[PDB]
Point group: C2
Chain length 396, copies 2
């Protein structure tokens, strides 16, 4: 893995800011920005018509489904594209109104992003299902595997969970959960958005019924995708398309496709596939090699960060996960998160003052003064971590 090369892909780097704000969205690689620029200009209004631009649009749409399918090892026929994972989850929750009806139960996770909590709560409130919560362990921040047996009942119809936390960094163990949920005929919805920049999810191996990703997370355009493991499951969902003759994933797509952005999605996934310049094979094969190489490198950088954070006397790490993406939240003794973030900003360092996380509420963190969240990207270096730690050391 050659971080110097990857940094070369990012014109927005070296501009006076050190980016530890990855969890809010990584920087846009030049290849993505240039693709969106040309595709927006050259893509037809519609996939229909005799003009070359219409065929370009049709081509972009197909390429985007194929690229997302490669990312999660699915079939393109199961890839639904929309503006954001949050919009797609909202659409799914509405399409699943019967599952959120009187007598049923819907499980959501205290560890999830609001995007994969709010619409399920909203559906339950509107239609009558009981909400059950998967809870975290207070002195680890993880979703313990042993709780799923008591949570899941014959009434369970929908389970919404994340593959990892974009606040605490912990990767969730869903293996037991998935079996139990399937045992009662419930739908398993996995939000892979926080982890997708770092880890490949194999929808065939994990057995999730639906997986969501958000391209914005890895420096792609703001486009989300909702991938069904079994495309047959989509015709169980009522159509929302304004085209009464729609078939396949188009049935779950509302409004004009955003072809310029979709072209950027393809390019952003190609960026992931090319992180290791030596990677050879199909796109899926190259993603595997490149993501592992990047993972190895980020593991080293993150270890240095974590050792450094532990060494800072006033820094209080929130949670401690067994497996991780390179994202960590912490508080500084008698220095509220907003002040930490402002101090960092004064030193040209960008971090996140984590605002509306349920898990942070639960851990009692937003009751002292909040948490600071930092995350690594593929262009992050050891020198940047040293700068962050020295800046944190300067605080009271």
């Amino acid at each position: 893995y050659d971080v110097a090369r990857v940094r070369g892909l990012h014109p927005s780097l070296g501009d006076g800011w050190v980016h530890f704000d990855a969890p809010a969205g990584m920087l846009i690689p030049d290849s993505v920005a240039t693709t969106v620029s040309t595709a927006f200009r050259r893509s037809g209004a519609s996939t229909v018509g005799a003009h070359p631009s219409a065929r370009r649009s049709a081509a972009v749409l197909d390429a985007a489904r194929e690229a997302v399918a490669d990312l999660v090892n699915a079939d393109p026929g199961g890839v639904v594209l929309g503006a954001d994972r949050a919009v797609l989850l909202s659409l799914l929750a509405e399409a699943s109104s019967s599952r959120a009806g009187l007598g049923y139960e819907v499980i959501v996770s205290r560890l999830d992003d609001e995007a994969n909590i709010a619409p399920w709560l909203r559906a339950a409130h509107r239609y009558g299902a009981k909400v059950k919560w998967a809870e975290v362990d207070i002195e680890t921040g993880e979703l313990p595997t042993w709780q799923w047996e008591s949570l899941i009942s014959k009434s369970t119809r929908l389970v919404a969970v994340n593959s990892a936390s974009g606040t605490l960094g912990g990767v969730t163990d869903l293996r037991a959960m998935t079996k139990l949920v399937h045992d009662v005929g419930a739908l398993v919805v996995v939000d892979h958005s926080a982890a997708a920049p770092y880890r490949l999810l194999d929808i065939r191996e994990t057995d999730a019924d639906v997986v969501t990703v958000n391209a914005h997370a890895w420096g792609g355009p703001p486009i989300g995708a909702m991938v069904f493991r079994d495309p047959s499951v989509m015709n169980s969902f009522g159509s929302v398309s304004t085209n009464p003759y729609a078939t396949g994933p188009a049935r779950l797509e509302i409004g004009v496709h955003q072809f310029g952005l979709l072209a950027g999605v393809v390019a952003s996934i190609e960026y992931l596939a090319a992180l290791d310049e030596s990677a050879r094979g199909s796109r899926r094969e190259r993603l595997a090699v490149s993501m592992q190489s990047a993972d190895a490198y980020l593991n080293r950088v993150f270890d240095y960060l974590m050792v450094s954070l532990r060494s800072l006397p006033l820094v209080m790490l929130i949670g401690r996960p067994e497996a991780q993406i390179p994202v960590v939240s912490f508080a500084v003794h008698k220095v509220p998160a907003d002040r930490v973030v402002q101090r960092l900003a004064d030193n040209g360092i960008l971090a996140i003052a984590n605002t509306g996380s349920r898990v942070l509420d639960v851990l009692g963190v937003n009751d002292v003064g909040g948490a600071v969240t930092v995350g690594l990207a593929h262009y992050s270096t050891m020198a940047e971590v040293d700068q962050l730690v020295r800046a944190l050391a300067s605080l009271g």
Copy 2:
């Protein structure tokens, strides 16, 4: 009005292709494409944080609200932005909850786009309201004003209607009906998306509660807006934001805003305001002048198109409205629409084989063969009309 100047804003024109496919989306002006290119590259992940890119995203978001507000003479505090009018209308229908419930009536219009029909039907099934239809006059294609008094009852809670048809071109007289709707405490939702490229809707003058538009229609990026006349009505809907600290239109917005496209929206409305390059005053004032001037020109070109089509015995125009935007649908005697559209394409002319129209279905036009839809754009010329007419004359 100077059509030569407007055509200069569209680099592809003059290459042989003749565009009469405006209803599917007009050509994207060069200025709009350039704006999206730069804004996409420069806009930050979110509106929060110390980086200049965050200020940029915040500024474009605010500017998009102001531009849309100018377009319909509203307040930016009532402007909700999203991927498409169809997504926003789906969200609205969902948030209307029991207003679409058993005991009440929802009115939809036979002349409407499926975007402003489907979500209301879906909501009616979920909650139980009786769906009633405003029907067209089978000769003129218009929604007669006299039908409203019997359609609207004390039980009416929601009325979804268009300002004009993007298939038949007829402009809908909503003056009397709006009064009647307000009289029973119902909401009026007006989809202005078909007419927006051509005529201004004044939300203060018309008294519509909610108005939707789609920037793609006039060659802007694929972004929709939903505008509330009264911010108080707006917050009586349930918040769907993943931000619990959302205020104003942000309460009704799901997902990361698409800042690059939002900048394009602003540019596209500036394009509309500058159609008459010599218009003076505020953007709001200039929109009025430029749209009036452009409509005056397009009315003459459309009149020429219409008399020409009426002179071809095989061409059968559908409807005959008192007021019309420059959009028309026609069948060709014993020639299917697909064959008409192909003959046109062979002469480098782009028209639409109309699909999915409830009005064309109800009129019997689609029973065999179907119809062709053509629409003018601000760059359309008399010479292009001649080319269309000659190609149609070659049939039979």
